[PDB]
């Protein structure tokens, strides 16, 4: 059995990652929580890599927020996320860890992308100011493998997902990422009998938008990928696997597909006096695609299964 | 007197800005060489800052090489520099380091960026291939300093020099950097009493360059200015100063200038067959002009200069 080290497996997604591992007799999976093993420490990092005798590591701790958090504390946000990546990547390598998969995000994009944002958009202009800094982190995290692959021959993957949601997301109608805020927002107008829902915007833009266990299926297949495989669609520079659905969804389509999901029986309603974003972001999955996984949840699907879970979870 | 902590001062740039200070009867100079302090190890750089009282910190310490070196360790230029940046400005800030300077580079830029370079092409299209894990890493060091800017309201400005040259550099001929390259190969070719020198390429490119002494009382002038001014003439998210003459250089020109100061009576030969790189690159150096500092060192001069530095150290 290959020993996996799943870093951030109580997170949304490294808990997605464990729950299909947990179902492989092929694999002993390696825990620790963030009060056993401190991930921005490097000397326990480096003695945890030193004692357990891992084979794969998939990096799934990061500290992450909404907008707020991010415009709020960027310091925590880089810091943290340097230290995170730089400490697990240098003891894997340093303990022979060969192999190695690294959840970045498509945050790492140009705010003016050419759209669906194929990898080679990776660099291309200016970030977005309300993400910048852990961006910058995550770029540097796909570089650190990169580097490591091309000095060292290391095995070091990384996957960007786009919009998650599923299982374990923060259901707060304050979250600022529009799935679980919306169908927290929809529940409880449910409740109320509120007679409308009032969403910013227009609803026009497109968004993309992928189930954390689609995420989770392809993070395992990536990771699991021949080499040789890997190789052939991927460059040592450019080796990034965009992860997603590669379907434009309109904010008006997801808001009153939720309404459905829930049962609402008053009217979503969109104010236009609030600007838009941009009109269109997703990602370009043709590199996935070629590797041999597409996504099997479909939106009305997923926001059902999800919206049960959040039912159990209350 | 001021604390003043020069992270690298056995460096080319390090002890350029170290010889003028330790010409300030109003700043205190804390020093330590790499075996005293292994600025890698955070534990170390923590118990430093803890014990030892620093009001500014210089942080000239970080792994450089040239062309050869940056496309054979690639993993080493990105980890050492994240990690060096990472555990001094972390550190700073513990402990209540509110001024800091980052000595960055120009590799920061676009391949393709517009020239001259200003302060905004940062971000704005690929990264040299040879250099981009260590550009990757000094950027990380900026958006470091802007995010401890922006969030506990530090002061930790950041500059990014143009090609140096002069004291300290590394005098062998297969430096990849022309200058001291060049300084020692017209050196030997006029002891050998060789007939030629040949130089690859057909001369027309453009380059910059500025002498390290220059590059230091920028340095210290950019680092001394008042806050209020800084933030004038700076963005908190595009927050760096360009440090360099703004004047271009053919490599004719130089390599001639070199001849000169180093009495070499053979010829200078450029072998056209051989590929120039782009036909120009160099600081737009209008944010430091405008903050009053202005290169005092021509080509000439400099050239003149450095080479005595070398006659007395080979
Ligand atoms: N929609 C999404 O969820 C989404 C979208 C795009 C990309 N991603 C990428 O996926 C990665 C994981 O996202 P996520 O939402 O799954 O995060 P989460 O799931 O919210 O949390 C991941 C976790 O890793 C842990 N961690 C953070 N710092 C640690 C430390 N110092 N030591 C040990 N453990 C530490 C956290 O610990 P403590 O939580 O207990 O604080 C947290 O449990 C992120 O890098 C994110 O950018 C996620
Ligand atoms: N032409 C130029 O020189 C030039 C141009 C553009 C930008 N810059 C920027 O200026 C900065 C300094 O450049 P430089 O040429 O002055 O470098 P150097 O001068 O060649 O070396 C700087 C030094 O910092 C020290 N250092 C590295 N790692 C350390 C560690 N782990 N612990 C303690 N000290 C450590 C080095 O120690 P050990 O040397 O003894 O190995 C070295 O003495 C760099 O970031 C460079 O990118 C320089």
């Not at 060969?98 to 959840?103: A, Q, V």
Request: one cysteine or more; hydrophobic letters at 40%; a negative charge.
């Amino acid at each position: 059995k290959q020993r996996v080290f799943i870093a951030g497996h109580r997170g949304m997604v490294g808990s997605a990652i464990r729950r299909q591992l947990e179902q492989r007799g092929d694999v002993e999976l390696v825990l620790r929580t963030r009060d056993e093993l401190n991930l921005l420490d490097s000397r326990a990092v480096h003695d945890f890599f030193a004692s357990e005798r891992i084979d794969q590591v998939y990096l799934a701790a990061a500290k992450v927020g909404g907008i707020v958090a991010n415009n709020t504390y960027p310091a925590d946000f880089i810091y943290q996320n340097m230290m995170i990546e730089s400490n697990i990547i240098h003891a894997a390598h340093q303990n022979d860890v060969n192999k190695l998969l690294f959840l970045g995000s498509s945050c790492i994009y140009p705010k003016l992308a050419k759209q669906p944002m194929a990898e080679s958009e990776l660099l291309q202009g200016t970030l977005e100011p309300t993400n910048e800094p852990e961006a910058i982190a995550k770029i540097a995290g796909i570089k650190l493998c990169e580097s490591y692959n091309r000095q060292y021959g290391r095995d070091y993957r990384s996957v960007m997902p786009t919009n998650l949601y599923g299982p374990h997301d923060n259901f707060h109608p304050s979250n600022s990422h529009v799935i679980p805020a919306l169908l927290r927002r929809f529940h409880e107008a449910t409740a109320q009998s509120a007679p409308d829902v009032v969403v910013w915007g227009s609803g026009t833009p497109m968004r993309e938008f992928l189930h954390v266990d689609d995420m989770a299926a392809a993070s395992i297949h990536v990771m699991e990928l021949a080499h040789e495989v890997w190789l052939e669609n991927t460059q040592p520079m450019l080796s990034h696997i965009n992860v997603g659905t590669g379907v434009d969804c309109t904010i008006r389509e997801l808001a009153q597909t939720i309404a459905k999901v829930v049962g609402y029986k008053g009217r979503v309603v969109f104010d236009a006096s609030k600007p838009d974003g941009t009109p269109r972001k997703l990602l370009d999955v043709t590199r996935l695609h070629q590797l041999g996984w597409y996504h099997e949840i479909s939106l009305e699907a997923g926001l059902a299964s999800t919206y049960q879970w959040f039912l159990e979870n209350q």
